[PDB]
Design an enzyme around this catalytic site. Sequence first.
Site, PDB file in Angstrom:
ATOM      1  N   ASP A 171     -79.607  32.702  31.128  1.00  0.00           N
ATOM      2  CA  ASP A 171     -78.821  33.340  30.077  1.00  0.00           C
ATOM      3  C   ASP A 171     -79.607  33.268  28.781  1.00  0.00           C
ATOM      4  OD1 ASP A 171     -76.791  33.728  31.909  1.00  0.00           O
ATOM      5  OD2 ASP A 171     -75.637  31.999  31.249  1.00  0.00           O
ATOM      6  N   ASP A 231     -65.426  39.181  38.348  1.00  0.00           N
ATOM      7  CA  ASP A 231     -64.824  37.856  38.275  1.00  0.00           C
ATOM      8  C   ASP A 231     -63.541  37.887  39.074  1.00  0.00           C
ATOM      9  OD1 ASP A 231     -66.866  37.099  36.622  1.00  0.00           O
ATOM     10  OD2 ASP A 231     -65.627  36.813  34.842  1.00  0.00           O
TER      11      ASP A 231
END
Length: 233
Positions: free
Chosen positions: A7, A122
């Site tokens: 990230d 998700d």
Amino acid sequence: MIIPALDLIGGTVVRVQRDYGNDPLPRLQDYAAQGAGVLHLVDLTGAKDPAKRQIPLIKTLVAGVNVPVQVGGGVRTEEDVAALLKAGVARVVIASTAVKSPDVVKGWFERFGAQALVLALDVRIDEHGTKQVAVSGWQENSGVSLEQLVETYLPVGLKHVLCTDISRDGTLVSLYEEVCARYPQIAFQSSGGIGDIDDIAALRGTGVRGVIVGRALLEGKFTVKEAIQCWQN
């Protein structure tokens, strides 16, 4: 495959936030050196503001390794997808927009092709045991199941789906066994819950095609080489 992940915010490698330095290229290069065949990047800066997409950095990182990179973060428009691909990205990771505007994204499949796109969902297992799709961990469910959303995109040739369980207590299987068996024509990727090498072993027989590993590598729990050896048994 194992899919090592970083990230990035403002050029900094971060753990979801702990600062892990400003050396993403050497880290990625070492992941590739150990045998990784695909890498995963999330542009957190671009996720917060697409106008600040880290295109120059992404260009550099992609240029600096010999393996395809899938990249996500603030992919809102056709223009965003195109700009990432132009920068050299192999696959663009589509998240919230795949939930919010399926007819628009179906058009993206038609333009760019299914090999260029990864749908990142998700999932929360609700009270009834339904796999509910949500656009993030801090927002409520969006009123569509994983199966319903997958079946929305199958007619335009969906091939890659990245599934993160955001309801699970602790680290890592039934969820992945279920969906992989139901859509054998899709290559599923798993994200989250990898805390040690045994968590990777747990996914081996499930039908999951890709295992995203991020934090565990940063924390020095195991190496990419060890992960691959485990995954391949």
